[PDB]
């Protein structure tokens, strides 16, 4: 579990921290339940910082991830939906209905927030390139988000 | 090599029948060869002469090669035991491209068992480097096959020495 | 690589037993000749077929000849000449013929002989223990060697299946064994107009007599038999060959293997 | 497999028939038990044909009598004693399907399930396949067409089409299971089969109804979707059977499919390809869909589709046969789904020729002419960009475009330069041009 | 555990029983049966894939009991 926490915020690879959390997960199997959540909470994070949210609905419909459900999981399901939906508004709903169970600083915080800016980046621009001079609050009403954070997020990017 | 043998026919003898029925297998494919090609019948090349020595193999095949007034090329088995590797399968080959670069010739193989072991595997030996000489010369028996020429004849004492390898329709059948 | 693809007529060369030729042919071909839909799937395809028929029917034939629908070239070795030394480091010699038939990919492996003189002399159980069995191993482990990517397979053309390592019969192990015996009557019958095809004499088309005296005789020994016929129209001189001239040659390639045998 | 021992083919000669008269209506088992013992006696003795008989003679038996669950049971105890001889279960196995296809019954599906278990316990490649497939396309015919039995016969083929196949016999296997695949309505395993057995071709250059049915049954498993030029890929596919069987109503409605489809497909250079190797061709000439490929091909011309629904809409009501047609757009949803698409279609490709001819174009005039409002034109022009299809430019404030990249000064003194060049070379040509004509016209 | 669990290898694959095999089998041949993993018909490696790389290029040296 170290050496996948360790990679995760060395974030150079994510399929390493995915095996490391898969091992320390199945060390834990239904031995210690805190270190067991929080090991298949960081494998599922990880997972859908791949960038492929497809192999989580199998990875939670297995055996032994129904066996620890808990709301934590379902909402790190919802959030890999969100990434289906490459909604950054969904994974900003999802935070918000379970902000307590995805508060912690310690790599779930700060991941969320990476991803957040990723998903952010990248809405920005898909939706960039026709544009040569577009208005401000046009680029907001399609990302659906206000105007502050909008102008923010495009200025921290071109900074 | 010898370029031409000169000893006759009628010096041998004994064996008439022998002699006369390995004649009609390689002396009549040599000057009436135009005969088996009409006729549709590819003559068989391989003849093994099995028989204690002193029993004129060695004088029989130069009579038949004079005979046949064609190459003659004699070889000699027992030496063709050679350490270095792939040596004799090498001797072999030339051989075999000599007696086709040169007529319709009579290869005179000596000391068959020498060459070819009855499969006999022992502790002290097995035939392991011969079997690779012995499987060349399998591979060059069906090299003359189209145009049939180039005879192989094959002396030895014991003929029950030799596995069922050699012994075939297009390879060694005529075991006299 | 000593024999390649190109080949005669074997296929109609053969003549006896063409149901057995093509029920070969169904079991080898398809894995060789799309092995890729064998990975597509997930299967394993078989690495060969055994061959019975001591004298008989010629397994070599078979060998050539059903490589008319495959492209291939098959190639002929001895299982001594593949142990050479009795290590189990004779498993360098077959990495080499193998590598040889990856370079040749469309390539097939034929046995020469692996039961040596499974009629009689020394089996699998005696002489060399193991040792035979132990190298046939070898190549069974190299069932991994990429058949999905690799056009090779391997026949097995031993002469009586009696003494085959049953250990080497079981799924994932040369599996697949076609029955050759003597041919019968109808065989023969086809195997001596095939032989008689090359010849074109008066003499007649009286088979069935032929067949009734050499019943049980070899396709090899009928070729024989045929060349016989040839020599003895040719020790007489004559540009003739009449069916007294088949009776002759079958009494004496009979009478020849009665005392041999 | 292994040597006879002792053969009883005079016993068996001398009881067996004597034995069913003994038991003609099978109420007897001391009979089926004793030919048991014998064919086990025989089974020790290793004698392949003997057993074969008897379990013959014993299926011939149930059938007459007609006991349904005897005979299920037996059957089970017969292939399960000890494997007995393979040659003679196989046997047993085609006997019992040449008699299950005889009698319709209502537990015939059970006869059918209870082979079905003997024959899969392994065995298959070997020893006799085309039973199991067989009883596989029984059930299929039994149950009338379902998922399960289709999902069934979907798992069932792979072994004995690779291990033995018929060129015949094995393919209409695969086509009679895919139908049923695509009637379940299974989309990805379905695609999945079609794109691992259409790999074995070259056989169909001597087909009679094969390659159009399965090319018949994957035009809807593509269109379903979201495929476009595969579809007139393998129409043109389906056209050129007609080419060597002459029937005049399914080629001239394969010609107007194809010629749709290939039109309609998304714009690539491959698409380019394949409407410039239709166009022109010979046969073609006589139908209306000649004037719509001529028209919506080349020449970059206003693809207005609310006037083309009328100057070559006249398919969707009355054409020639129009019954390709009415299968595209006159159906209701998925005909009006295909009315979108060609709708877009026209839209995008009035948009590409826009691009190679107007540099900047107003936003009225390019929402004017692809028929759509400011919103949505601007969306269209979004999604072309992303695809990286068009070089576009936009100030949407000021709501004006531009398709042309910014000269970098380099290249730009560059082409001046090839310019100056091409001039120079002008003059070389022309100074030796008019000295050499003016040399001809002064000899006099 | 480089390519990741033998790229999602089973549960019951544990090499405690083809790692104790006091048969030298160098890292190479360590590193060459971990990619003797290349059986494709699965997604997945079982002990079977194991029990063959093992099994491949391998010398029979036992016989620890007398010494112990
Ligand atoms: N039929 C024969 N007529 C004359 N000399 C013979 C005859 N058979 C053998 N010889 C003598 O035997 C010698 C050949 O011996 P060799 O070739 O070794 O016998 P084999 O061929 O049986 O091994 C010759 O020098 C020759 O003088
Ligand atoms: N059915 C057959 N038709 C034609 N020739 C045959 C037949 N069977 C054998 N032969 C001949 O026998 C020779 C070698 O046969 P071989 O493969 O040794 O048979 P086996 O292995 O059964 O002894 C070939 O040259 C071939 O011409």
Redesign the pocket.
Known sequence: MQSGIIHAAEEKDWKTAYSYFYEAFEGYDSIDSPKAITSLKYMLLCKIMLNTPEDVQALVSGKLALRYAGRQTEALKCVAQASKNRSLADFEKALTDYRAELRDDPIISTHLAKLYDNLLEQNLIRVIEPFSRVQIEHISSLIKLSKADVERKLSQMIL | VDERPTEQYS?????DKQIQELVEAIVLPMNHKEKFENLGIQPPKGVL?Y??????????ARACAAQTKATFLKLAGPQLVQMFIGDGAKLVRDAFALAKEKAPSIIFIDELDAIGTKRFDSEKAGDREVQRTMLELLNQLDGFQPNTQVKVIA?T?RVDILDPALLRSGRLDRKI | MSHEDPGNVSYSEIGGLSEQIRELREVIELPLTNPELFQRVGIIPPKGCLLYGPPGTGKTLLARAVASQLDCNFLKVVSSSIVDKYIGESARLIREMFNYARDHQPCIIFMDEIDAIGGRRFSEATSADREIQRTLMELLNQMDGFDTLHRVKMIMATNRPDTLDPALLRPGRLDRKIHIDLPNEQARLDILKIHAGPITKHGEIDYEAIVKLSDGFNGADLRNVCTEAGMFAIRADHDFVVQEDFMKAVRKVADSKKLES | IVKMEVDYSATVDQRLPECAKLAKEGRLQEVIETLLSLEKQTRTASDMVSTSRILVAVVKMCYEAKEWDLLNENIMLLSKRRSQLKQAVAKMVQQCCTYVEEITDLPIKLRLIDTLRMVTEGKIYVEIERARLTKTLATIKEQNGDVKEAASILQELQVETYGSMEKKERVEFILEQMRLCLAVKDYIRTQIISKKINTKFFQEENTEKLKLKYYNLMIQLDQHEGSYLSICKHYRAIYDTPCIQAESEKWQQALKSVVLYVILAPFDNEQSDLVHRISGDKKLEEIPKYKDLLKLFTTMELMRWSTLVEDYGMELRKGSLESPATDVFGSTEEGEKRWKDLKNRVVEHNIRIMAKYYTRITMKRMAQLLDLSVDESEAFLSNLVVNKTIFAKVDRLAGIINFQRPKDPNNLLNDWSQKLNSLMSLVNKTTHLIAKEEMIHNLQ | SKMNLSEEVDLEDYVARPDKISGADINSICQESGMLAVRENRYIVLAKDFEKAYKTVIKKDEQEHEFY
């Open positions: 010096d041998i003898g004994g064996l002469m028989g204690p020595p002193g029993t004129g193999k060695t004088l029989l002396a004492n």
